[PDB]
Structure 1
Amino acid sequence: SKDEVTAELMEKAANQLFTVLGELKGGAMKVGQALSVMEAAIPDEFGEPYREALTKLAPPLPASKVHRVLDGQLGTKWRERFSSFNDTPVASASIGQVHKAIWSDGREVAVKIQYPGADEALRADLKTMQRMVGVLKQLSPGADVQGVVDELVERTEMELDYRLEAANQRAFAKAYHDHPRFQVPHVVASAPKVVIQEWIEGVPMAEIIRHGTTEQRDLIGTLLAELTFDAPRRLGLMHGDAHPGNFMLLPDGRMGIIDFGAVAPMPGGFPIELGMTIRLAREKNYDLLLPTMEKAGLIQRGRQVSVREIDEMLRQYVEPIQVEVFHYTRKWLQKMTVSQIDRTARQMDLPAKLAIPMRVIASVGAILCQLDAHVPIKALSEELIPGFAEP
């Protein structure tokens, strides 16, 4: 059990690192020091009316409560929209359960049910943290807390209102209806705490990472990379930071996509500067590269820039397209974390239209390395990514 003990030690070191980052770049003080201030700056009358909301949430939900939630979101005659309903959950959600059933039209549908006391527990949890943001802003000198409230409010309701996630899925269901390579389940019914979609199943990407075949890894890895670039060009949207649980390989060779609670807006499609930057980076055209990256916002305006660092900055994007079929390995990813610079020209505040895809691409690239997949990324880039193909 000793490797999973490393996993817990790895998660704990990673989570405390982000706490330190939060202290230095956010609250401008330690978590211990801040907790002291918040204890006094926040009344005890607000301390526990919050407490009671969290106790309502034994681990799997009893069937009587599943009906109860269904009695609310779908109503009195919710069993008349189903042909049958399995009271035993097939999976677990973040704050709910997933039930397999049969719709009235004969289709197999997957039904997600949110726990009864999760709405109050999370909304209260929002107000408390929102209250703490006020404390830091008013009492902690030199604290950066912009948009932190906006972030938390958006995250919360995306978790509490299933209609928002379902709306995103309906968007991908139309653009990728009848598609040769991608299958997105249609949304049958949507409610604040109940969402119903078509049932699909295959080989989970997680199962492929563990002990999948070489061909399985390459295939679903190629499809994942294609989805990253095709979605913004076709749908004006980008599927957010991807977790292996969101994807599966269908028997016919297609990739299944089941989660859309992370969709980010890309109205004007994929930016032209990104593909153009990588193109100039590969051809070593530093003469046209640096002014381009400056205009785009990859590097800071009016600052001395090292070519040596530019190469480190883009090599995770350039090296894959320097061949026809790149082999995304973990060993390669380890080499990317090695700097020839020994103790900043980067832009630590990228514009939104560049920040969104680059984060997604980075997360996708990490998954491809866990897959040990062979991906024709060079071809995909020429076809889908604007500016990358030579004019």
Structure 2
Amino acid sequence: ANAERIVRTLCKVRGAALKLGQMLSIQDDAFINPHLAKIFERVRQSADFMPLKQMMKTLNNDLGPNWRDKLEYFEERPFAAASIGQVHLARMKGGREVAMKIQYPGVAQSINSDVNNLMAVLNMSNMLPEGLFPEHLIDVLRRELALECDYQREAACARKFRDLLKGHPFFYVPEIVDELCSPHVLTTELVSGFPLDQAEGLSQEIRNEICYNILVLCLRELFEFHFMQTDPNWSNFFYDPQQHKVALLDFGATREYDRSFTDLYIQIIRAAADRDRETVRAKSIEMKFLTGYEVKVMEDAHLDAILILGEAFASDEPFDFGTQSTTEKIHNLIPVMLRHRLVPPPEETYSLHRKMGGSFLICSKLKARFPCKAMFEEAYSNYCKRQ
């Protein structure tokens, strides 16, 4: 199918498209259709082409006439995309550099029809990964897209993560600039660097270190903070090669999980690291990752992927995230819950199912290789003590 035609149609529903991209890990790795990955890159960069006066509508509606009055400089071309918004560089009256993430107008009101239209385009493209059927994507995307609209809550999540990561040697969260925040605008101090989804050209040793730190953060989110971002937006993680630090800009749809969920989940990962397939299966059915009735090949998609996670966490040798077989297994975990079930599971169960795999997949994209047993034993030990 013709790429720029698809790009043009996806741009009309860019919020829905990019959010779905985050949820499905649509990226240039060993598994995704390369034409599809390139199309999604084009949609991201096409924030450049989105109407001027749409931005100023949102700024008008949210902090009225006079906002410009706060600024020495407002860059009219965004420097990044963030699904239902785009991020602009500004300089406040005073010189302070900021990053203003501005929502497209009326996204909350066009969610159902936008998700509808997105699935039409993706269905006709014939580029969707195997096992993903549009009708099974609709509901989960509509719900997650509505959550992304809540920039007041995203600001609150950013504040909490900044507190959690205070003093961290690698990660940092820029300060929220309250005077430039509203329901539809989220402003932080500026960050600089490689977006991580563009970091493939860095040295092996630097990619290894970035990704080791990313997977550790994932484990801490799951088992220490109990506060986690489901589908992160790696294009809004910024590596500064000068400081050797990664800035975290996007906290959309961050979730708290109770002890009951996290208890059972860590038992599943422990079982996988102990190479206990039957216990992974049983506890997966308890969790409702599986209903227990899946056809054998789909059951196996789930079990083979979780056991690959366990393989990494059980090995004192470096794990090679970038192999095509590992990349494929982790992607093929995603369709397991995306089917019509007799009993719809809790929304948060869907999100938890995708979380660890998403982190493995940015490691795959960046062709990282590093040992994982120590991070898991640390995380597990730490969790068990508080038990």
Q: Same fold (TM over 0.5)?
A: yes
CA distance in 2, matches of 1:337, 1:168: 28
| Paired positions, count | 316
Match of 2:325 in 1: 332
CA distance in 2, matches of 1:244, 1:338: 16
CA distance in 1, matches of 2:384, 2:114: 50
CA distance in 2, matches of 1:225, 1:376: 11
Q: Deviations over 1:301-323 (max 9, x none)?
A: 799x99x9586353221221232
Structure 1 residue 123 corresponds to structure 2 residue 109: yes
TM-score by length of 1: 0.64
Unaligned runs of at least 5 residues, structure 1: 19-57, 131-144
Relative to 1, partners in 2 of residues 1:368 and 1:270: Cα closer, same or farther, differing over 3 Å? farther
Q: Deviations over 1:90-129 (max 9, x none)?
A: 42544554321223564210123344xx31x651454798
Mapping of 1:44-193 within 5 angstroms?
59-62=49-52, 69-82=58-71, 84-91=72-79, 93=81, 94-104=83-93, 106-115=95-104, 118-119=105-106, 123-124=109-110, 126=112, 152=142, 155-156=145-146, 158-159=148-149, 161-189=150-178, 190-193=181-184
Shifted more, 372-381 versus 104-113: the winner is 104-113
Instruction: Determine if contact 2:330/2:361 at 8 Å carries over to the other structure.
Output: no
Match of 2:216 in 1: 226
Match of 1:27 in 2: none
Match of 1:141 in 2: none
CA distance in 1, matches of 2:279, 2:101: 51
CA distance in 2, matches of 1:337, 1:232: 18
Matching residue's letter, 2:109? R
Unaligned runs of at least 5 residues, structure 2: 11-16, 21-47, 117-134
Aligned match of 1:314 in 306, 311, 319?
A: 306
Relative to 1, partners in 2 of residues 1:96 and 1:262: Cα closer, same or farther, differing over 3 Å? closer
3-state secondary structure, aligned to 1:271: helix
CA distance in 1, matches of 2:143, 2:328: 38
3-state secondary structure, aligned to 1:317: helix
Structure 1 residue 375 corresponds to structure 2 residue 361: no
Q: CA RMSD in A?
A: 4.6
**Structure 1 residue 354: deviation in Å?**
5.1
Match of 1:236 in 2: 226
CA distance in 1, matches of 2:87, 2:269: 42
Q: Deviations over 1:159-200 (max 9, x none)?
A: 3x5323323322222222332221111221311332211100
**Structure 1 residue 337: deviation in Å?**
7.9
**Structure 1 residue 214: deviation in Å?**
0.4
Matching residue's letter, 1:201? S
Instruction: Determine if contact 1:270/1:386 at 8 Å carries over to the other structure.
Output: no
CA distance in 2, matches of 1:288, 1:97: 44
Relative to 1, partners in 2 of residues 1:72 and 1:232: Cα closer, same or farther, differing over 3 Å? same
**Structure 1 residue 267: deviation in Å?**
3.8
Structure 1 residue 258 corresponds to structure 2 residue 246: no
3-state secondary structure, aligned to 2:244: coil
Aligned match of 1:212 in 190, 202, 207?
A: 202
Instruction: Determine if contact 1:112/1:194 at 8 Å carries over to the other structure.
Output: yes
Matching residue's letter, 1:247? F
Q: Deviations over 1:224-245 (max 9, x none)?
A: 1112121244443111213320
Higher RCO (C-alpha 8 Å, min separation 6): 2
Relative to 1, partners in 2 of residues 1:196 and 1:260: Cα closer, same or farther, differing over 3 Å? same
Instruction: Determine if contact 2:111/2:142 at 8 Å carries over to the other structure.
Output: no
CA distance in 2, matches of 1:3, 1:333: 30
CA distance in 2, matches of 1:3, 1:330: 29
Larger radius of gyration: 1
What fraction of aligned residue pairs are identical, expressed as a percent? 22
**Structure 1 residue 203: deviation in Å?**
1.7
Matching residue's letter, 2:376? S
Relative to 1, partners in 2 of residues 1:233 and 1:269: Cα closer, same or farther, differing over 3 Å? farther
Match of 2:28 in 1: none
